[PDB]
Write an enzyme that holds these catalytic residues in place. Structure first.
Site, mmCIF file in Angstrom:
data_model
loop_
_atom_site.group_PDB
_atom_site.id
_atom_site.type_symbol
_atom_site.label_atom_id
_atom_site.label_comp_id
_atom_site.label_asym_id
_atom_site.label_seq_id
_atom_site.Cartn_x
_atom_site.Cartn_y
_atom_site.Cartn_z
ATOM 1 N N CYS C 162 0.788 -1.210 0.000
ATOM 2 C CA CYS C 162 0.000 0.000 0.000
ATOM 3 C C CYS C 162 0.834 1.281 0.000
ATOM 4 O O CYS C 162 0.506 2.307 -0.602
ATOM 5 C CB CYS C 162 -1.079 0.082 1.060
ATOM 6 S SG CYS C 162 -0.454 0.987 2.441
ATOM 7 N N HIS C 189 1.920 6.785 9.488
ATOM 8 C CA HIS C 189 1.103 5.664 9.053
ATOM 9 C C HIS C 189 0.153 5.237 10.166
ATOM 10 O O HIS C 189 0.541 5.175 11.334
ATOM 11 C CB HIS C 189 2.007 4.491 8.661
ATOM 12 C CG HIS C 189 1.329 3.439 7.842
ATOM 13 N ND1 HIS C 189 0.386 2.579 8.364
ATOM 14 C CD2 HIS C 189 1.488 3.083 6.546
ATOM 15 C CE1 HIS C 189 -0.026 1.755 7.417
ATOM 16 N NE2 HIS C 189 0.633 2.036 6.305
#
Ligand SMILES: [Ca+2]
Ligand SMILES: [Ca+2]
Ligand SMILES: [Cl-]
Ligand SMILES: [Cl-]
Ligand SMILES: [Cl-]
Ligand SMILES: [Cl-]
Lengths: 346, 334, 346, 334
Positions: C162, C189
């Site tokens: 991702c 993140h």
């Protein structure tokens, strides 16, 4: 024969004005976008329109706005349609009628009392709905619990609180089916804008709302249960309650522990709630959690998986529990009452 | 000196080790856990909610050196594999999420330990002890005992005080509880099949079943069968609060309720009139902290419902109670 | 003339099978519901179907499923259509072809290598897309960055990670317009399922993933930047990076600090990104925050408000920043590649 | 004894009070803040992130009694209204989110104080001091000085060490930063008009502008104009980390970088090789904690980009630096 209702039969557009474009005002605007025959034609808020347009487009808990928002000279362009945005600090100075506004959602928190909220009538608006209690000469309405109390001739009404809109249908169903002797409420409630992001002096002097709201379980006082008599006369003075504010930014749940006037089983309680269900009061048997009700349209969602009937040698204590998105569930109720009130005006 | 061994170096096992460091006449001489000792040493030193360890920790061949003293760290999986006696251990703190059974927990005695305290309910053939509520039930001849759960250690002195002063007909508990390691960090299949513990624990209000109130009779016989309850898990990593709504056997006032709690106060059951919040109790050593600011007495034409509320750090409050029971249990020997 | 492509012209339905119904597998299922001409006809996962149906219906970060889900004997009833759900632990035992499956999304994490993923071909599936790197004889594809590398004859491919799907279009645009000497990435993140909810022994031995992920800023290693050469050959060996995991359950942002081969201005950089924008790589000048990208369909969303060009006596350091929902942005990319791969099969 | 007065009893003012309790020869004899003293006493006792106060606090007629000693609490709004001299105060900690100007801050001298330290940048005509980086610039005759910001107190020793050992061409900073009181708890109009600080701070990653790197020249002249930076605010209530990506004037190795930081270590700048996380530094007294586990040296055909990373508790690390500067400043008198 002609003492008849009319707006239910031949009303084209209900034009709404919003005074106060905070969380509730903006979410009511969003809901009205999806209500045929109701549209906002005027917003009044002292905040810079650039800030307001940005907060309408982007919403941490309720997602991105469904459409386009662009600032214009006198207001916003929202999905094409222009919508005037003023910033008058005196409600008597808002010329609602020039924009065709007939009903005002009064959501600033500074004009709760009848005389204060009636200032909107000077500008030509006909009716007013307050986003809070709920004074001495003003009716309190939880849609699909007691909106039949309205005859359409009232000028100012209250949409009650968000906690009242969750508790009321659940407490009423117990009263109608079994009878309530007394009960205590506990809401486990998302943090809100009256709490501090970090520990610091609170303007009201509340030593608990002074604490970091996203990093604590914070007890706080409530009024929904003590004031329930305004919505359900038969429960006047029978309930009390309080809240625990916890670290989620929206989504809440209301527990009621009650003594009833007759003995019941868990299945009987759950069946009674199912029969009372409607578009305002939902019923579920799925073991959901708080994120599953964010953005939902029920004012109150009864959770049959949390029902308890404690029976000790025939003496019973009952627990019933209902979910609500303290933002959108309350907003959905406000918008139902806004439309109904405008349409039975006569 | 009471020589203690710890089986299971999870949250409770590590915090109990931290407490025992300050209990003179009690010392841990043997830990064993199926985890690499390097990982265990790191988790003892650094603790998200309870802070950094007071002292020095160094990994060495057979275990840790903690503040000088070496402490053997094993990695068995059957208590019989633990030669507690070679390390002089007399009493074992049994703190793995399993083994909560008398015959299962008695396995430690083969390794040479004399007594066992299990850090959870497991009491069909095992006495359940909330210190300063019912530790007088121990005569010293038991082999395995339970320290009960942390919710029980919070509820019990509060419920006992109502029973002693006023009499309890019945009651329902709600605990607003920190999330724990049996919940998922993000939505995903839960091994027990629980559809609510499968959900992201730090991003939801999560209803949870409990047993503390239904099982209170094991600690307070006079309340057996009189209570039930449940929990709402919420997004804090530690710190919890227990509410009890009860029908009593006589009418009371708020002041009378609060005064009774104050009179029941001790090192296990605290009393406050300060309007605190959950972060104010993380790390505290009381098993239970009664909060007089949250007391309610609802009186409707003379019929009363009473609400009382106590705080607890579901980690350190429970651990402090366990270590009280460990010391007492060892002291009254056999 | 007839060495021609066909599936682009005359393919009716692309039948997809999902092996591994975790976060990504379920979200890919959700996206495919909205992709005309692509449908999932088989799920394989060892979890009890009652648990799987519940997690498909209710999703903390991505909202409620749009439709109805009901458990049936052999699988689910989803919006009417029955969908078989098996639980074979050996991929060679999955009879994909009996359900018409032509392409498999392999999302368990236990069959990354070519030979392992090719086991799905025994059951009759034709192609496989892996939800992770990305081995020795397997191409790595970021849609709209390098899917032209596919000729349609490959059996197993990787959808990359991702983080790679966010970084790749941003790094490629710098390389194409200005040239990259070298650069370092920092992703801020969301926490993920490889972190612990509370401090405890981590199976991998990672002393940082052992810590409570929703209550800490947690540094962690990455591979997207070091491995970028697999997607952008011209950047092979030029980048490195790492991550800071922080307490949000989804939503992330990637910063790249780079030395370029020529001097630029902030406006020139932003204009280059705008020109590279497409359905995978978005462009915005709004000062958004992470909640504004949850659920979005871009693989990568460049944020022009965060661009920096530090110029010190003519020597320049550049910072560019792109948002991504590490859940749905990656899923949207996987589904684009799934469809494209199936349709240029030939 | 250095008698200190505190104007502004917010996060920094309260934590500085807590620290000064342990600085022998320094004591607070006058607080003043426009808040009701009952509220201030409660917030001193109970602190979500920094824990409960070490001692006793009791509200009394004119202020607090803290560990016996009475401390006047005023509620003015113009430093001239503060009779610091009647309370013997020599030096003032100026910690309200305003007043960061020499002429504005010099108002305290009319009340009888001798010196002023402002708890934020305000340095056009005011020296800016990061203790153990450049406090040698003080000669003792200054009236108003700045303790800089907390991001500057983290970055400065790290950037200074690179400059001293290797030389810095240029660099960009990113701080992953706890949310602060200038952000909203839920989405709503921000008084400054900032469209990002208007958003819910505990539920978002929020980009934020900074000034620490652009203004570093005020603390390290040799770095003037060489740095820029920005921040990502994230959902922790305290605890932050600063990353610097830099072009240096010579090629280096990771070991060389880490060794240089260790050699620069002191009571203001710590060194660790443990893989810690943000909760491990909340409450620490170092202004800056270099983390050798996060060092990167990217070398592409001999051209290098270097990343160095330091931790800081944006609350207590900054406060400890302020109090170091307060003590030193008072000590070197005039
Ligand atoms: Ca409409
Ligand atoms: Ca489809
Ligand atoms: Cl109430
Ligand atoms: Cl229970
Ligand atoms: Cl990398
Ligand atoms: Cl800067």
């Amino acid at each position: 024969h002609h003492h008849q209702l009319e707006n239910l039969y031949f009303q084209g557009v209900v034009k709404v004005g919003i005074n106060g474009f905070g969380r509730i005002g903006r979410l009511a605007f969003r809901r009205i976008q999806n209500v045929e025959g109701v549209e906002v034609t005027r917003i009044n808020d002292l905040t810079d329109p650039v800030m307001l347009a940005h907060l309408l487009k982007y919403d941490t808990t309720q997602g991105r706005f469904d459409g386009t928002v662009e600032v214009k000279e006198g207001g916003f362009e929202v999905n094409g349609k222009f919508i005037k945005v003023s910033a008058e600090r005196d409600p008597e100075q808002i010329d609602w009628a020039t924009d065709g506004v007939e009903i005002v959602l009064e959501a600033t928190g500074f004009f709760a009392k009848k005389e204060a909220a009636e200032k909107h009538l000077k500008g030509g608006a006909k009716k007013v709905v307050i986003t809070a209690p709920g004074g001495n000469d003003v009716k309190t309405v939880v849609f699909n619990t007691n909106h039949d109390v309205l005859d359409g001739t009232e000028t100012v009404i209250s949409g009650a609180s968000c906690t009242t809109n969750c508790l009321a249908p659940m407490a009423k169903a117990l009263q109608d089916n079994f009878g309530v002797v007394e009960g205590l409420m506990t809401t486990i409630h998302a943090y809100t804008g009256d709490q501090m992001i970090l520990d610091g002096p609170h303007r009201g002097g509340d030593l608990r709302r002074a604490r970091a709201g996203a990093a604590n379980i914070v007890p706080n006082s409530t009024g929904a249960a003590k004031a329930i008599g305004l919505v359900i006369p038969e429960l006047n003075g029978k309930l009390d309650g309080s809240a625990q504010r916890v670290p989620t930014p929206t989504g809440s749940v209301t527990e009621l522990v009650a003594v009833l006037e007759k003995n019941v089983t868990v299945d009987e309680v759950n069946a009674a709630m199912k029969a009372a269900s409607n578009e305002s009061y939902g019923y579920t048997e799925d073991p959901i959690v708080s994120s599953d009700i964010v953005g939902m349209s029920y004012g109150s969602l009864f959770d049959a998986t949390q029902t308890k009937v404690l029976d000790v040698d025939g003496k019973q204590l009952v627990k019933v529990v209902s979910w609500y998105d303290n933002e959108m569930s309350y907003t959905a109720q406000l918008v139902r009452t806004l439309e109904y009130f405008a349409k039975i005006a006569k």
